[PDB]
Amino acid sequence: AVPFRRTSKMKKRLRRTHFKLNVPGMTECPSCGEMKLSHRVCKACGSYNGKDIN
Amino acid sequence: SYRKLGRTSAQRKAMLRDLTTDLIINERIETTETRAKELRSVVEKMITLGKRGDLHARRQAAAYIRNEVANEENNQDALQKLFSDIATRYEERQGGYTRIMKLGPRRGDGAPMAIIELV
Amino acid sequence: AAAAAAA
RNA sequence: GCACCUCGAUGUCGGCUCAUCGCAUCCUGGGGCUGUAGUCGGUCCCAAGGGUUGGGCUGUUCGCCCAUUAAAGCGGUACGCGAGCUGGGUUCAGAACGUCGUGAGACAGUUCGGUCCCUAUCCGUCGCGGGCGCAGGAAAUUUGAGAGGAGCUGUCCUUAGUACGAGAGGACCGGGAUGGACGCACCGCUGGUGUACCAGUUGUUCUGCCAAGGGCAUCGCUGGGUAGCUAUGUGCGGACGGGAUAAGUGCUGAAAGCAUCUAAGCAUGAAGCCCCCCUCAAGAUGAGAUUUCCCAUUCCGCAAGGAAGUAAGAUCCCUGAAAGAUGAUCAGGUUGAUAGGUCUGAGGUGGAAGUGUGGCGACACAUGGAGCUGACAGAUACUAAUCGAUCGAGGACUUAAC
RNA sequence: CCGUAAACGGUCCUAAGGUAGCGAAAUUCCUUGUCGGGUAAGUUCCGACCCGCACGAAAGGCGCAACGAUCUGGGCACUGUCUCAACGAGAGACUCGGUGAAAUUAUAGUACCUGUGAAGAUGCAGGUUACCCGCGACAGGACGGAAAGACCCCGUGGAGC
RNA sequence: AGAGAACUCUCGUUAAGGAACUCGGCAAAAUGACCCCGUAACUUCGGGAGAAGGGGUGCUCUGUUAGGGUGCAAGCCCGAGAGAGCCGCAGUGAAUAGGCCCAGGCGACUGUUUAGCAAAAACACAGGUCUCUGCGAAGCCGUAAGGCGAAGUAUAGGGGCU
RNA sequence: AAUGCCGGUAUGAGUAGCGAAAGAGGGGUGAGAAUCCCCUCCACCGAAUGCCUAAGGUUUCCUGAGGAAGGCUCGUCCGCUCAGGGUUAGUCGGGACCUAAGCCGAGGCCGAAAGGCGUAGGCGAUGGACAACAGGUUGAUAUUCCUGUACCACCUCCUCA
RNA sequence: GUGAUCUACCCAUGUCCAGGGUGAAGUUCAGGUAACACUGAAUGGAGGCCCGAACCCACGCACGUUGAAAAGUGCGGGGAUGAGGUGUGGGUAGGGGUGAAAUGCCAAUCGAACCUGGAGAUAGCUGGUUCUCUCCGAAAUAGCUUUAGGGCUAGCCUCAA
RNA sequence: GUGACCGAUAGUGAACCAGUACCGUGAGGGAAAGGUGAAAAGCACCCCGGAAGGGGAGUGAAAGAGAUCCUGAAACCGUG
RNA sequence: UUAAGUUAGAAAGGGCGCACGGUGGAUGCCUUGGCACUAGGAGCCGAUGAAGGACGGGACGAACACCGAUAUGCUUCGGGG
Secondary structure: OOOOOOOOHHHHHHHOOOOOOOOOOEEOOOOOOOOEEOOOOOOOOOEEOOEEOO | OOOOOOOOHHHHHHHHHHHHHHHHHHOEEEEEHHHHHHHHHHHHHHHHHHHHOOHHHHHHHHOOOOOOEEEOOOOEEHHHHHHHHHHHHOOOOOOOOEEEEEEEEOOOOOOEEEEEEEO | OOOOOOO
């Protein structure tokens, strides 16, 4: 449970290839925008298909 | 299979009763999404219990509704509110008395929040 | 002896 | 035996778990010689494919004994395996017995008791993903270079009480059932579990009180139990067979006019081998094959090539499980049953509340197979799967016919 | 030591050679001594034989009711200790949001087999395999890490008795 | 926050067997509450002994029971032990309150000890025995003064062994 | 190149951990709320997880602002920061009362020196004596502040026997 | 020189031990002696007594072992009116104290506590010892040695005359 | 008054609120930490931001000189 | 269009070089303080209360220095403007 050798810079950067995170499913809000993530109520106008329900 | 929601079964029952009654008075509450999904079936089952209107269904509902005041300056309990307003409002509708609308994640823990309302 | 009793 | 490696540490016995390898083979398979009448045997060959046990004693390996078995085989892998496990014995600090020593103390002599740390960096292994390649982009179906899994056997009946044998005894070969161990699946039964199912019941508190219920007391306790997961439950497998073979048995035959299993040519022959049984398999860079869609835009770069939109198709996002740590897979996204709700059922529990009757009452009876019911079915868009967005090709050059 | 059936006789030696009571023992190398009980099977246990290496009479001997967080055997009840494991609940582990270390570390693009070598190789030789980068697990190796081995030896080192 | 993977820990059940496990019933399970009957070997006659082994507990009435406590009385508390019954698989219905028996070793016993590895057979213990000491005692702490012993006086102090 | 010293920065790694045990919702403030305030349910302790009172800490207590760092996350909040404020006694505890163990100790007895011991005397509570209770009051003090009734010790410019 | 604010023992003065049982000595009434003895009931409530809470302790297992903790937690366990626990104030100090005796304890320290000096103790032992080029170039042998991994002299090397 | 004495890991432990902070019951042990500019002339004013912190505009010889503030290396972290 | 060959480009990310930055206080200057001394002086202060401290004193918030209820001081004699 003890590291025998230190990790080099290149192996660390190769391990950090998949550490990035993705862009969310964000779309144009039909009321005002911009923008609104899919299948959630818009935080700006408080509308959802298409009534102001807050 | 139902969710456990990170609680003991007694804590699960107490939290579900609290959320059911609080939805029944305030008519719109904001919880997490999985709590909403676990809550909506119980809430529509209790509305279905309120549909019957007899004494046995009311005594079944009294074992689940907590004793909090529903309507101020009227001394109406929540158990009276199910059998006076909600049952008469949803007499024609057959199921689907609640809807869940998702919000963004919470600041403190990244919890996806949801709006629950009686429709 | 070789007793493994390291503390 | 030596002291080559380790004393700025290579944990040492015996057990548990997991195994793997070599036959100098314990059984099973095929044979030769027997002072092998048959069964059972003895010795020597070929053969590692598979299997080679449950206890009593002792820390014990070993060993003895009990009961089986087809047999309970020898060894290597740091006397395999303690960053996988236990410390009973060795092997600390305490205290005794016997012996030695004036003594402090000592004893491969005995006994009682005695702290076993580590969050895995890399290679290894077991699973699951994301890229790019496979000279266009896709959706399916696949061949198999290779690899892994499996490979064990008992008992009974016929042949036949036949061959053989004075008798007792008693077959080889060939068929048919039934088992043990192991393995793969799945529960329809038998059971287990089933913390959002049903009922009974104790103490206290609460819903103002009776009644009826809620909270806590291990799910308070007790008696059952749907789905799922399960074995101790059920079904199935190691079947029938081909090719070249080992030890053996040979045929025809000369070197060597004979003889001869061999030097040429042909056979037969084992649970060994390579297949037939099952599974993964074109990153098999040697990137394979068949079927069916989409088409050959625009703008720069005079050539190579590079950007934008798109078709076929796929993804982001959402409903979920026959899947699952997360990804992934699968069923689906409003010309629809994907999940929840509602209704009707299956199954479970066992006769709800209220009312009435009988009783002084605890209680019983009728309404009434009642009431309740978590994941199990079938209907039903009532609710949520909205609007949307992103990725995704214009197909290099030679050679023979077109 | 030698005879004779503990006990008596002959001899050496000393101050004199173990009395009673126990005895294969917290004491017995041989040894799992022999016999019997307990069990189907008992290197442990119990009761006797003496064959006491190397019991023994206030470093007390032999018994002993009650007592013991003591040790060693055997029974009833009881059970997941296993035959032989299967479910269920909670916490961690898994995912996401916030915060965020440590031991260790010559550099490292860090396969396998057989040999070779300071005699046990990820890096050497010959061969066999292997597209790139991650995530969840196991721990065979890196003679893994942690402590200038505690054992053994040496020092004309030390300390306690 | 949410999924309810492996594995680790704390728990709860489990068919048919049961200690076949293991160094060793370690751990776990089981009994354990109140009342009644009964209780062996042995013994220092105190014990062992809650030995072992068996039976019954819930609720209603007869029932402000019989009998006691209190008070001037009415009235409020403690209330056995029984007869009619009523329910459930289950009645100290939950939670806390012994697992027993036989035969041996050692130590009598209660107690004390290696704070942080060993709680024991070790130490201690009343009793037993030996030895020293006549008081300004012996033996101790101090160069001494001073003091403990002891404001005690051989039935008293100190030391050794058991 | 000393298992060197000091300072800085990596690896492990976005990894282990975030330290027993119930939270849920609706309003409010605010740039920002799962963590701050209010309300309603629900839950836990209850021979305590309740009340106070020593030792100890010493400002940590109250109010108004603030959020840098410290809250193992966040923070509009805090035992954090800055400004101000708060502790009232003849009767409570101690001292102008007493003494035990022990300590100091004029003169004094010893001792190279330094000092050690010890009368008279004193110190020394954990003990003995001793006089105030019931209500209210602030955001912070209560047998101390206030309104009632009291009690203890001491003294007379006074009045009585 | 500094320490008994942890702990070992002692001194003085306080305080704590919910409940439920067993039941002694003694006394009374009977059976009973001339007067004692012995037995059965009543009273009595002794015990380094029993079961069991607070309190103290550490026997078994498990977890933790870069822990919530430099010794704990959970489930059981032992003592629990006494050789008891505990508070306050004191005393014994390191060739010393204290010790129901373990080589235990004396501030996470003990076969001789800690701090400061002698002191930069000593170490025939291990590690380390910092720029370059050129010329030459060893030995691992003998003797002696409390000597065997050290030293001295010869042997072998280098420079100059 | 002088150094073929030191220059901030050096020189007194201490060039700086140093025998200080801190550690230990105590005796005792004992740090780290200098530099804007010649002159604060220490960035008036505008914009983003709750603030911190930036971008302009000014002072300045220099603002990359802006409060651990002269010069600013390497390990380390990043973007093309 | 088929069949057989031969090549380029591919980058999730990475390596090397270059450019531009951040962290940090090495280096270089630099003393406000030290280390050795030299030539002289001084080598004691205290019951007429010492050395060393505690607590205080400023309009103003804490500390250093200074001072002491006459308290960030008070007299006399000189220097200096």
